[PDB]
Amino acid sequence: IGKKTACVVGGTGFVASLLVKLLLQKGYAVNTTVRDPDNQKKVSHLLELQELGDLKIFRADLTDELSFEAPIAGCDFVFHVATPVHIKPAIQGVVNVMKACTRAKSVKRVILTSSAAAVTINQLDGTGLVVDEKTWGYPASKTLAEKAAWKFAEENNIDLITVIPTLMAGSSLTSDVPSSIGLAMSLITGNEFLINGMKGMQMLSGSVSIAHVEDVCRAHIFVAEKESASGRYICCAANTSVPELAKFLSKRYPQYKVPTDFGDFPPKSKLIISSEKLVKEGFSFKYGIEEIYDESVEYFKAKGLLQ
Ligand SMILES: [Cl-]
Secondary structure, three states, X not given: OOOOXXXXXXXXXXXXXXXXXXXXXXXXXXXXXXXXXXXXXXXXXXXXXXXXXXXXXXXXXXXXXXXXXXXXXXOOEEEEEOOOOOOHHHHHHHHHHHHHHHOOXXXXXXXXXXXXXXXXXXXXXXXXXXXXXXXXXXXXXXOHHHHXXXXXXXXXXXXXXXXXXXXXXXXOOOOOOOHHHHHHHHHHHOOHHHHHHHHHHXXXXXXXXXXXXXXXHHHHHHHHHOOOOOEEEEOOOEEEOHHHHHHHHHOOOOOOOOOOOOOOOOOOOOOOOOOHHHHHHOOOOOOOHHHHHHHHHHHHHHOOOOO
């Protein structure tokens, strides 16, 4: 029967977890993976999801192409998030996984997540970053991992499609908060460091582009299900600037004090990131900027990271 199966590597992932939960709700039979099941806190959100449907964990490292044989087998779709909200490891992580998809008839299609943003963004979680008085890459650019994924796929006739996101906010199943929201939320949080971060985001990528992880997630499935889908799919809901965002947050969040004056800082960003191709192929974004921020704000408080 049309009893549908899919595999979602690295189930701990901010994006991934959310896929799984969401797949399960769609009826799919989900297999996911993780390095070491033996962090009780780590999987804590994964256990809860079992309640929703037939979720079979598997234990996987991106180092043994063997790991993937187990979880990958029987699944119509493989979802691997190449660049997780947190270089050589991913690039290897993407071949192995793809390797295993050669060794299965079941796998009708692979859909991969890579973005330049996350790459950078997780640098911001890095240690020893230099501060001056007064990295960031072309948003539509292809990570090596992505680039590597494409080559292979082409060489081994696999059916790949990639989803290219930007700033991802909303809420997350995972216990700890993701850098990426904190950054999306720094304007409300008032974290000076993260604001400069986001300020750079604008100059060095020349856009403040954002999306809700559920929407980024749906986008992944939809493309997975749409038989007519070919290629890369830039997924961003909102386009803005650090000033014009902070104005906008000020005039929707009286409860909080969002810095409303930048002086020199450019009011417009150089680039607008369009998900037309995506929309053109028929996706509709549930969450706009307003709902992204209510969502992100309401989670943060629920996280106990607000007043
Ligand atoms: Cl993620």
